[PDB]
Structures are given as structure tokens and as C-alpha cells.
Symmetry: C2
Amino acid sequence: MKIKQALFTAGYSSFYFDDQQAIKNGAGHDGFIYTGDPVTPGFTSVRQAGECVSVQLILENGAVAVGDCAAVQYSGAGGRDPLFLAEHFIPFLNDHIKPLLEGRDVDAFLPNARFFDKLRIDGNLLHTAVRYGLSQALLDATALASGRLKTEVVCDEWQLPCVPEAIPLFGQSGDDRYIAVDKMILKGVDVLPHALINNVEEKLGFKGEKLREYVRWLSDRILSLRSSPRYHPTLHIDVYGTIGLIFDMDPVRCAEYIASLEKEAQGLPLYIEGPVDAGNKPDQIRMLTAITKELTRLGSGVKIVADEWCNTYQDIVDFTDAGSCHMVQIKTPDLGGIHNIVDAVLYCNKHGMEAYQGGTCNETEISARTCVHVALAARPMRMLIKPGMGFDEGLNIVFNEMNRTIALLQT
Amino acid sequence: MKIKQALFTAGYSSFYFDDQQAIKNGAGHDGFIYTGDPVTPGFTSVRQAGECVSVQLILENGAVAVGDCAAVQYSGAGGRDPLFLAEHFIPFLNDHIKPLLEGRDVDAFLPNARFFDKLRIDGNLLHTAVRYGLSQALLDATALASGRLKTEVVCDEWQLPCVPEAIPLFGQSGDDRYIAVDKMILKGVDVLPHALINNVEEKLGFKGEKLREYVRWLSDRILSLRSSPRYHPTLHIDVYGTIGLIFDMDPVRCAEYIASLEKEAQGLPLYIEGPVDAGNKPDQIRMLTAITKELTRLGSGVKIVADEWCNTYQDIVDFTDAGSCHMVQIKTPDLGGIHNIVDAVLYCNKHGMEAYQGGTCNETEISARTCVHVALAARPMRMLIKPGMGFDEGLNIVFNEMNRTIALLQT
């Protein structure tokens, strides 16, 4: 079965593109607006409306396959591709990509995904967001062409068993780190709450005391508000390299502090994401490896998660092969074609690395829904509730698609 | 084409069920949680996780049609049906509705919609949320059975032209009435920001002075932050009957006050939703009619929107026939089957009433997406961005489905 027509439509994604560097530099704010000038290439303001491009593929059988081109909030940061604006990409896609899609056979997914993942226009690989959206739509096309769910296509082409089972979900609070926790407890979230600990003085504390007090508040809140003692979620907090900043980038001192947080969790498993940011991939791998080594030496039960500088499929392989940390965030839009997510999760699983199938608040309902199918097939240890910063909406999107799909698979 | 199998799966909707009478009375607050105990017949807490039931209809051709049963945040209030819990409704659906779906013909939509809308089980109509969700799934089924879009099915069955054209969208801020406005300006929202003016002392002011100041803040913010004068949105603020409270239900005084807000809007058209709450439908119609009469006598350009006590198709007809106000919120889940939305919008359009196709923050991505199709066909003057209180996610869902669908119709 062929694609008859391909359509590209501009839209809004579920958050904003933020110039992370300008914010780190100290940009002030006025309401939701960051002031001053941006510094990251592509940005014309420190904060810009998040955008996407929807891909629709009308097939010969009349079905319409969908996918969304989307990019992370902190685009252009940490080795990632630049922010993604529809204005530029709509003509580009209509001119250069539409003719490569129309008439294309979709009975299989992988060959098409690989083709677009390696395509170069004017010398450059397609933006990861374009590969992300195209690959979502191509997976959906193969599914709709053959009476299969997207999950089933993945299980068939990767020769995976496809046992119907939920994936633990992780809710992110943004700066709403108190109110969002209550929401997450009310909705029985498996892993929480991210907490956006992205400032030393006010969020982590100069000696880590603020984060210490937050973990205690968090575990207390869970133990106080939960409707049954059966609710025993995992704590996962992202510190945006701030721990490294207060301990002179000393992996041993970092590990000591991280280990000291275990008591504050009151028996709930604890994960700390992005403990340090070494500023480049090789140094980041070495630094996380050293922290992991010291955590083990201490007999700590606290785990660390790689994120910064771990973008592509090969990056994930490199962090895994080095035994650098316990878990890696596979930040889905940054991998380009979604077949790379499947390969990354399987690579992690084979080698004992915990796969966190993440993503961004700045993606879409379609990209998130598609990611649910990738996860149900590949079996990561954790999946981000996305998109958006409201939490409720992302949970509705991810949890319900997951449970709807499990129910379908069970028929 | 028939339905082969009907599945019902519990999920979370995009907000919370709140016990209205427990609150405005005196329920305490602790973070996101309300304290004390509800009075409203079905509530186990003053605030509980919003729930939905997803309906999946597997057709003979293998397609899977979807719809979500969902109810409003303030369920059980204002004449609306009770809160909606999956624990109760899944067994109900499997016992009473599944036998009526499996083997059912879906070549058309309207007969099925009408059947379930009027069906009585033990003498009672189905909960509006059930009719809402079933009707969404049945529309989707007719569409998927015939290679049509949902919007096309509606246009075919109501003999409408389906001109591919956008509908103005309305963003709601929740209590985040300052920050959310910035989000909405950045994303060029057509109508904004609701503002949740639901408290006299803190939001309206005992003499309406706080709302006056807010309208000025709002228009100033739009005029300052917008990138160009081409962005000229409409203002729509919901006051939850508080204007009626401060003027002791004197419609002339209410009108005088509403009219006085025009100055503060600085040329942006202004709508005030729910100016008064007379506590019952007949009194509500009379009160709004009197306010409208006085606004017209004053030559005011400010418009008012009915909401409370205007729930069902027939309620909408009654408010319209009375010439009671400029616009009515057709609050979608409360109408039961979605064919009632189409009929209500058409009735308004024929009889000089502006149709606002509303909804709730407490519905889902599927219900919102389905509502887009209803609006593109029926042509209301305004459509709510939903679900959720984060705004971004709802805009992504509603705006992007709208534009995707317009593109498909143009093929």
C-alpha cells in the first residue's frame, strides 16, 4: 500500500522554546516573559511559543496516518538541533519531502524510517524534529495499512514478544513543585515529580539543604496524602547539574551528598537526574562514571540518570558501554527517527542499563501518543508523562493511550 | 459496517471533580487539596481526580473508533449530572451498553446517537457523560467505516457545506489569570482569558473594582506584549454570578457595571460570561434578558454569555427564544450526545444567538478532538480550548486538529 498524499500543517506544541543559556545567564522576567536578549543561535526572544509541524499521510485505503515534528524546550542547547519553527519548515517539507513521500510504499516501516533518518538536503541531515515527525507518521502509516496497532508493527519488525504490560510513568512538575505533587498523588503517579531543581541558591541550596528539605517534604506529602499504604512511588528529581556546581565538580563529594538524600526519601526509591554538567560528552561520561563508582563504594541505594550530552542513539550506546550511570534519559525528539528509540531502549535493556523513555513538555499529543506504542513494544523502565507543564493533560494522553492499547492487545 | 467489539477502559481526565457546594460554603485548603467533607451525593472528597471512560469500538474492517465519557469539573451542580467514576460506570457499560453495541450498524451516525440519547435503563436516561462518550465513538465509527472524516459525516447527515474554515478559539486561564494571559498572547489566541473570577472579595471586588482593574491590566498587557497591532483579540471573562451578588440581583445595576467595563478594554471586544446566577432556569432567563435589555438601552458594546442553568439542547432553545443574552455556552458534556451540540449550534445560528461551543477543563484529548469536528461542521462563533488548565496542551489539541482537518478537507 502506498501513500497517496502527504500534508504538512503548522501548529503549536505544548510548551515553549526557551533559551536555556540566556536563562542560566540570569535573565530576569516579567510575568511569563523572560527579559533581555537571547544568546542561543536561532532565538529571537529568550522564550518563544513552541511550534510543531503535523504530518498527515493519506493512504490508498483512505486512512490518514499522523505524526508531529517537534523539538525540545531547550532547543539548541547541549548539542541538540536548533529550535524548530514552522515558517521555515513548511516550504522546505513541501518542496523537498512531499515528493519523497507520495507514492511511497508503507507495508513496512523500518526501510522508510532509515531512509529519512539518513537523508541529506544541501549537505545536512534533516533536523531531528523532522525525522521525529516523519517517522511517527510512517509508523502510523504501516499500522493503518495493515490492520495493526503501531505497537504491533514495532514488535513485528524488531521481532519482539509484545506482552501487554504497563510501563511506569513519570510526572514532571516544572516550578510548580508543591502543587503538582498533590496532583500526582491524587492520580497515583508511579514516579514523580522532577521538581525542576535548576537554581543553586533557591532550589538546590548552596550546600544542598533546600533540596534535602524538599525531598523530606516530598516523601512526607506522599506518606500523608496517599489513600492506601500500597502507594509506594519512586522519586525522581532533576537537578540540572547544580550538585556539581556546589561541590567543585568533585564526583566523590557529589556522590556523598546524593547518598545523604536517601534517608529523606523514607523508603521510597530515589533517582537523581543530571547531577553534574561537564559541558561535553566525553567529560560527562567520565564524571557520571566516577559518581556511580563512589555511590557503590558507599553502598548507596540512590541512582543517577544521564541526560545532558546523551542525545542520539550513539550517545546512548556510549553512556551505556561506559557503565556511567544507572539510567539514561532517551529524550525522544533528539533521537530523530523513532526507530532509534526502539534500538536505544533494546540496547540499554540488553546491557543492564535502565532505559528512561523521556521526551519534552514541548512536544504534542500525537508525538506522545506515538511514543506510548514505542514503549509498550520496547519495554523501557520508565516513560515521561508528556507533553505540557500542566501534568494532568499529559497523564490523560499517556496513561489513557497506554491502557486503551493494552486492552486492544488483549483482544 | 458493524461494530465487532466494544471495549471500555478507565482513565484519567484532564482535571478534577470539585464539590461546588462544599467549597463556596467553607471547605479548607491545603496545597491543591480541599479539606473537610463533601456534601454532594457522589463525592468521597471535596476534590477528587477527574476520571473518564474510553470507548473503543472495533469495527468489522479492523478500524478502532474512539470516544471518551467525561463530565464537568463541577459535576452534580447547576442541574448537571453527577460526578462520573469509572468504578461504577465500567460495570454499567459492560452490563447495559455493550450488548447494545456489539453487532450494531454504524453506516450512519444520527440514528445511533438519538437511540442512546433517549434510551432508558430502569426508567432513567443514561448519564450525560455516557451519552457524550458513546456518541463520540459512534461518530468516529461512521467516519472510519466510510473513509470520511468525522466533520464530513456531520456535514453529510445535516446537509451542511463544510467550508474548510477556522473557528475562533477561547483560552481559559484558571486562577493563573496573569501568567496564562502572556502564554495566550505568545500563541496568538483569538479569545481570552476566562480569568476564573469566582470570588467577590479577592477577584471581583465588593464594588467590581478589582475586575475593572483586571480588564485594564489585561488590555494593557495584550497591547504591550503583542508583536503587532494585527493581534486584536476578543476578551471573554467568566464571573460565576459574582456581579449579581454585589448588586443584589438588580439587572439594571448589573448592566450599568458591565457596560462600564468597556472603557477598560481599550477597543478589544468584551464578553462577560455568567454575570448572575438566579439559582434556577426560569429566573435565570428573566434576569439575563433584563441585563441584555439594559445594555442595549445604554448602547453598550459589551456582550453577556449564558452558562449556568443553560445545560441541555432544550435549555439552549429556551435561552435563545427568550432573546436572553448575546451568546450561550453550549457546555458540550452536559448536552449528552454530540448530535445535540450540532442541533444547538444550528438553532442558535438560525435564531440570532451567538453559539459558544464550550466544554470543560475536566474532559479529554479525544473528546476535545472530536468536538473540533463538530465545530468545523456546525460553525459556532467560538470554541473552548480544552481540556486542562495548563492551556498549552489544550491549544495544541484543538488548534492543531482544526488545522489538520481543514487541510484534509481542502484535498
